[PDB]
């Protein structure tokens with residue numbers, strides 16, 4: 503995917519609730535640094551729902567593609583209030599940006 507387009511999507515749809523930088527603050531949602539290859543619910547010091555904590559999948563391109571299409575369908579009971587990104591291209595670009603930004 504396109505990292506620059508993904509950053510624009512992230513700022514538009516995600517950044518109000520999430521930081522990506524190493525040591526970045528929790529906001530409404532957890533800091534996302536180090537997400538790739540990590541199980542659900544593992545950001546230190548964030549109070550996850552039992553639903554997010556117990557989902558038990560590993561974050562990566564495949565699981566983010568499914569989650570971000572419809573978060574509540576993938577993790578029923580999640581307190582992430584976000585309807586989803588319908589378009590495959592937009593999700594792919596956003597995920598390309600997250601793979602770069604959350605590993606810097």
Ligand code: HEC
Nearest residue numbers: 515516519530531542543544550551554580581582583584
């Ligand atoms: C605030 C209104 C949110 C918006 C907009 C987005 N996210 Fe979110 N997210 C938020 C909360 C409160 C939580 C915790 C959910 C819970 O039930 O405890 C989350 C969770 C995520 C996760 C999972 C993190 C993990 O398992 O460690 C991811 C990967 C995530 N959120 C990504 C994400 C993206 C990419 C967004 C823009 C499309 C986005 N979120 C919007 C709050 C909010």
